[PDB]
Amino acid sequence: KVEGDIWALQKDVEEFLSPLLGKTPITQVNEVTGTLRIKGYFDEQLKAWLLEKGF
Amino acid sequence: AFVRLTLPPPKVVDRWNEKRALFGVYDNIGILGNFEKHPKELIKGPVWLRGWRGNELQRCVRKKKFVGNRMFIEDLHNLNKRISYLYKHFNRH
Amino acid sequence: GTSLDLLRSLPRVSLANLKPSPNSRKRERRPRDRRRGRKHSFRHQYQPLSLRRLQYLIDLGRVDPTQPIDLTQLVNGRGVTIQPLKRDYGVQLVEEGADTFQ
Amino acid sequence: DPVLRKCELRIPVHRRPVQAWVESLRGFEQERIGLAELHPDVFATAPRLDIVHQVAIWQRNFRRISYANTKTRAEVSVAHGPRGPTSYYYMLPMKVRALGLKVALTVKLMQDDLHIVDSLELPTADPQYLTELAQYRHWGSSVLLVDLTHEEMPKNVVAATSGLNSFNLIPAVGLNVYSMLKHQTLVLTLPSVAFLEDKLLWQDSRYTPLYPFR
Amino acid sequence: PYMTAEQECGHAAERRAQAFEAIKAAATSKFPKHRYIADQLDHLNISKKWS
Amino acid sequence: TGRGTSSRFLTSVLHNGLGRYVQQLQRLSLSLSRDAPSSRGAREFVEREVTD
RNA sequence: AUUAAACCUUGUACCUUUUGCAUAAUGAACUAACUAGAAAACUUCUAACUAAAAGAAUUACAGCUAGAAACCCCGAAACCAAAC
């Protein structure tokens, strides 16, 4: 359930996960469905990071 | 082979006739009708396949059950023989 | 929603214009040409409710804390699924959430 | 006095309401009489035309029944010929069909093919008036008229639409994707929009049913 | 032979290691491709016509 | 194919380039449809490149 | 190729089958028509919704629903029942 500029989210998501993951995350963007696919499990870090944004 | 030596007459078809114009109307009866009537209930046709679909053997077997008592004796015997071939083909090959 | 704006610029859609999503439908092979030419019941089946599963219902307010817990109410809230065809005979609890349900 | 409508259900805070010009069919120049708010979750859904494409295929194909039959070599007193009555019936999930209807509504509004009206009532029953009014407002050659319920639809509108092949009159429950696509522009009464929104917005918290909702 | 066995040893070791590292990156780059709304939306231009 | 097909010798129309080159093409005719995907490219060509 | 139809130069009919070979071996007077690949248990792919999913009967500690995705033809010696 991503709304707005997906590219802006991807840039921030890529930046946030690059240090934690150690390299740029491998991701696939399904713009038609408005979803982002990421290899590996990083829900806990992303969920906490989303809370920081205020979502 | 050989081909016609005369041209067929031109034909004009109306695409906005009531049947074409109203095709698909009330297809949302369930969602817009509180789901009281399922769209499957709107199917009109052979009794054994109203709201139901299956393979040829299933369709034939269901047909026999629905109208077996009301079918002709000759037709029933033919249907029984036909069912045998269908059963073996799908269930053994 | 810039996508909506593009629709206004784009021409009016028609029935013929509709096209299936990419990769939604695979191709098929037909014999038109040479391509396909040539060749235990007695033991109760207890359905348990986890303490963690119990905790969120109260915390989410799905089940009223004042009202005593009722298995029928849980079914009313779709908390648990019981199938007569499965012949479920009992209800249990799951150790999960022992440390998270105060 | 503008006719001001607000969505009965709670619009999301992060989503702004969708708005359109309220119209009336009483007079030729009554193009705009009010401003109405439309739920973003209904009238601002993503334009997923494959769902609409799938729904249109479903509409064409779930009613498809072929009665072709032929006698094979064994039945001669065709190796692969049609074999009796054959049907192609299948069912889409109610969630998808509701979503497909939601997608279609946005496209018509964004393409300026949807015209929200207070009521269908017409000063005269002459079919000429409806056609002329459509030309007056530059509506498409085909205009679809939707009312809240079939029983209460005005007599004057019935006569005008009944005699017009390209202008079809349907009730709220009769709305379907194929009719919307076949008709260049859509005319909806304000009560119908609320009726459609309620059913479409009902999908929220879609309890998987163990029995019919009734 | 101009170069003795001592000269040969280790002269090209650095390049060989780098070449494999590039090979490793290319090998482990399998992933699906992204999907864009513009592709679906641009399809409607197929219906464009003159007034 | 050569046996079954015609052939000619190298030649010039009227020694076109001896004094001054003359373009052989003299007339172009274009048919278009207002509402046709097939002619859209030609229709777009008319807007932009036909004048040039 | 040619100025030129024939001359000059080059070239061991076709399908099937043998083995990736026939100077083997099968089959063809010719024309027109007719004449043989059919299934979803699981998976990938395409989407909906999601600790829930399916319009009753189904599965679930990310699952669940929908769609698409598959496997020919002709031909024995025989055998049996009931009439004639």
TrEMBL record, chain F:
<comment type="similarity">
    <text>Belongs to the mitochondrion-specific ribosomal protein mL43 family.</text>
</comment>
<protein>
    <recommendedName>
        <fullName>Large ribosomal subunit protein mL43</fullName>
    </recommendedName>
</protein>
